[PDB]
Design a protein around this ligand. Structure first.
Ligand SMILES: CN1CN([C@@H]2O[C@H](COP(=O)(O)OP(=O)(O)OP(=O)(O)O)[C@@H](O)[C@H]2O)c2nc(N)[nH]c(=O)c21
Length: 652
């Protein structure tokens, strides 16, 4: 297939942090970025597959992006403006994905901006103190305005005269100002009782609409400054869209993210598959093929498309609300990719959706915190173990509707590893940051869970305190278990009773990740290859085929590696052997890259730099050999191709 991006959620409680220009380009603000989605025929997808593609990220802001508006002037649809809590308002070109200009005029946290419908280079920004700036970027000018000492929530330039701008406030007040008259208040619009969420001008000449947290929409005659009709709706963000096609109809959000189309001529109509939590923005987009769509962003972290002719949802783009901590592919369901997210939901992604590139199912029940580990049962379908940062281990029947089973036992600290292995029918092993590895019974998960350090102590000859275990990986045949430790040690234990056969002292810091090379290779000696990463940059590979066959009486110490992979410049969070190759490793690092290695020749192959933060996990696509999935603390998962990469090594 082609690349995909599982992007961060659109930001919440912003009057305008997303917009769309006609033809088919949609942009929404998410974390520190603006993500770009070409929507329509020009997105290039099979008739049946939803016509959208995430194509671009606008990279450059330092803190939360508070506002985003496109330039809607014909032949200039490629410009757009952003505001950010870093005090910046940047002008962007979407073809280059770069900044054209900016201004740090605002001395207080910006609330919103808006690109004038009439003046080709005028962007009007307002902050939480009530200060409004006007910025003409092609003429290099900047008019300062102060209207009143109140918290600006929204701001909409008039489509019908260059000088009028409506401003809504946290306390319900709405006013219309004139820039050419130095911010004079022309119309005070008295009526609202609470937070103004949106202001939409009538598209034909003038009237004016406002949605407020006081559960009413209001239309105003901006001539006689009076309110000529009030609409009460049947937790709330109340955003509006006045369609140019139906100048007599009006779209609004409603409780629970429900969307309405009212009739100006007490009457409403329902959309639809609907949103489940409050909706923040609504963006009209007319495709090349003349379809009238409307894009909606929502607290439920879905980005939905609506066909205004049918008022049904054409597709949904889901998003991630926290770090992508974990990626697990199922061996029973081949395309099934489990994602552990910091926002407390597991994502299972059918990466083989015949007619849907983002077929993702969320799992709310049971989980109530950062999912930091995941593992599929090797044989049972739908069987998915997860661990959290509250130390909770859990099991999940992902075909079922029903809330998961929780282990009666919690780890003291975060759950970083989960592996299935034989009991010491199949047992769940969970490792916590405190250093305990526990053995769970899936049959009776509420019962006793045995800390395996007691058997390690019984079956070996111990007179010291055991290490703090930080990572567990079983070998492919289910006969050798490796534990990584805080000191950097890795310990090799043999099948029935965790007999220790070997200790590797190669790392000098905490081990984060161990992976054994797969058995499906084209040669035996490879399944005994172990890859490991620690809080240091250098990755090691070790060849344990001697000591496992040697089956020693006493445990042996190893101080020399089989292969050394230097390149990364920060800790290694995850490593994975390619299932389609022999000795090909991918590694995720805190240096924000992922490196593909041919581990046998100590050769760097390619380096993925598409992430915007520290990487936490990597998983090879189980069917495409040049395709890999990544997860980082940028609230993203990228599905990228080895062959599309520009660099072979990690930076420095
Ligand atoms: C403490 N860690 C951290 N860690 C790796 O680091 C990532 C983030 O962990 P974290 O909760 O930020 O731990 P922390 O030490 O605070 O991270 P940092 O100090 O780098 O910010 C995880 O995705 C995980 O792969 C770990 N992995 C294993 N196996 N065992 C561990 O004890 C730990």
């Amino acid at each position: 297939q082609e690349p995909r991006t599982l992007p961060p959620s659109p930001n919440w409680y912003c009057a305008r942090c997303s917009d769309a220009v006609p033809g088919g380009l949609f942009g929404f603000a998410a974390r520190t970025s603006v993500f770009l989605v070409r929507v329509g025929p020009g997105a290039g997808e099979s008739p049946g597959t939803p016509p959208f593609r995430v194509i671009g990220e606008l990279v450059g802001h330092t803190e939360r992006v508070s506002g985003f508006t496109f330039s809607h002037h014909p032949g200039q649809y490629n410009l757009c403006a952003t505001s950010s809590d870093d005090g910046t308002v940047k002008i962007w070109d979407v073809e280059t994905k770069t900044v054209v200009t900016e201004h740090a005029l605002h001395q207080h946290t910006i609330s919103t901006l808006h690109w004038s419908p009439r003046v080709k280079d005028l962007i009007v920004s307002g902050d939480e103190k009530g200060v409004v700036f006007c910025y003409w970027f092609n003429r290099n000018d900047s008019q300062h305005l102060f209207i009143e000492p109140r918290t600006i929530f929204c701001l909409t330039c008039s489509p019908h005269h260059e000088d009028l701008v409506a401003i809504g406030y946290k306390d319900g007040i709405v006013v219309i100002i004139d820039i050419s008259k130095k911010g004079e208040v022309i119309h005070r619009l008295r009526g609202h009782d609470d937070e103004i969420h949106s202001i939409a001008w009538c598209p034909l000449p003038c009237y004016l609409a406002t949605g407020s947290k006081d559960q009413t929409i209001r239309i105003w005659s901006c001539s006689r400054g009076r309110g000529v009709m009030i609409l009460k709706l049947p937790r709330l963000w109340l955003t509006l869209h006045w369609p140019s096609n139906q100048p007599t109809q009006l779209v609004s959000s409603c409780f629970g993210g429900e969307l309405l189309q009212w009739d100006l001529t007490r009457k409403y109509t329902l959309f639809s598959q609907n949103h489940s939590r409050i909706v923040f923005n609504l963006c009209p987009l007319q495709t090349e093929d003349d379809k009238q769509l409307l894009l909606s962003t929502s607290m439920d972290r879905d980005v939905k498309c609506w066909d205004i002719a049918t008022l049904e949802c054409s597709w949904t783009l889901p998003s991630l609300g926290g770090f992508a901590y974990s990626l697990a592919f199922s061996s029973v369901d081949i395309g099934s990719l489990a994602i552990g997210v910091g926002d407390g939901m597991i994502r299972v992604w059918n990466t083989l959706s015949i007619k849907n590139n983002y077929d993702v199912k969320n799992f709310w029940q049971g989980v109530k915190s950062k999912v930091t580990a995941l593992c599929w049962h090797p044989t049972k379908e739908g069987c998915l173990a997860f661990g959290t940062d509250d130390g909770k281990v859990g099991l999940y029947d992902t075909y079922s509707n029903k809330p998961p089973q929780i282990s009666s036992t919690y780890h003291k600290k975060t759950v970083y590893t989960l592996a299935w292995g034989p009991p010491v029918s199949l047992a769940l092993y969970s490792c916590g940051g405190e250093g305990i590895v526990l053995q769970h019974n899936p049959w009776k998960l509420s019962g006793e869970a045995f800390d395996i350090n007691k058997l390690i102590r019984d079956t070996n000859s111990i007179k010291y305190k055991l290490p703090v275990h930080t990572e567990i990986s079983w070998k492919a045949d289910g006969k050798i278990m490796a534990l990584g430790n805080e000191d950097g040690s890795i310990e090799i234990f043999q099948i029935p009773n965790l007999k220790l056969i070997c200790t590797i002292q190669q790392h000098h810091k905490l081990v984060n990740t161990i992976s054994w090379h797969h058995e499906h290779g084209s040669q035996p000696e490879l399944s005994y290859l172990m890859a490991s990463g620690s809080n240091n940059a250098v990755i090691y590979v070790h060849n344990l085929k001697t000591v496992i066959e040697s089956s020693p009486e006493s445990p042996v110490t190893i101080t020399e590696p089989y292969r050394t992979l230097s390149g990364h410049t920060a800790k290694i969070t995850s490593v994975a052997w390619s299932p389609h190759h022999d000795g090909r490793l991918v590694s995720a690092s805190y240096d924000g890259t992922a490196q593909v290695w041919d581990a046998l020749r100590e050769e760097p192959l390619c380096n993925f730099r598409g992430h915007r933060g520290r990487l936490l996990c990597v998983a090879w696509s189980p069917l495409d050999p040049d395709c890999i999935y990544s997860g980082a603390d940028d609230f993203c998962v990228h599905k990228w191709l080895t062959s599309m990469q520009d660099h072979s090594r990690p930076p420095q």
